[PDB]
Amino acid sequence: VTKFNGLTVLPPLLTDEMIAQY
Amino acid sequence: SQSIIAYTMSLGAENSVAYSNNSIAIPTNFTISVTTEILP
């Protein structure tokens, strides 16, 4: 599987490692 | 003496069980539960 003007990419709550534990 | 803390959230406790080629677990008692669910 594959900016500057007020744009903000918020992160997710469940990270990847926490997901694999599920 | 209460304050705010930050931590990495837990995903539930470990509940590992033994194993064998001949092990089995059977219930002997039970309980009747009642749950609630709201849907608009």
Most A CBs within 10 Å, among B11, B14, B15, B16, to test the A interface: B11
SS3 letters for A1-22?
CCCCCCCCCCCCCCCHHHHHHC
What is each CA distance from A18 to A9, A14, B7, in whole angstroms? 20, 6, 14
- Name chain B contacts of A18, Cβ cutoff 8 Å: 9, 11
Please name the residue that has the structure tokens 């926490």: A18
Q: What share of chain B is helix, strand, coil (3-state, %, to 5)?
A: 0, 0, 100
Rounded Cα distance between A13 and B39, Å, is: 25
| Closest to A19 measured CA to CA, from B14, B16, B11 | B11
Q: How many CB pairs under 8 A join A and B?
A: 4
How crowded is residue B37: how many other Cβ atoms within 10 Å of its Cβ?
4
Please name the residue that has the structure tokens 């009747």: B32
Name the resolution in angstroms.
Answer: 3.6
A22 touches B11 (CB < 8 A) = yes
- What torsion, rounded to 10 degrees, do the Cα atoms B9, B13, B14, B17 define? -160
Which residues touch B17 (CB under 8 Å, ≥6 apart)?
A: B25
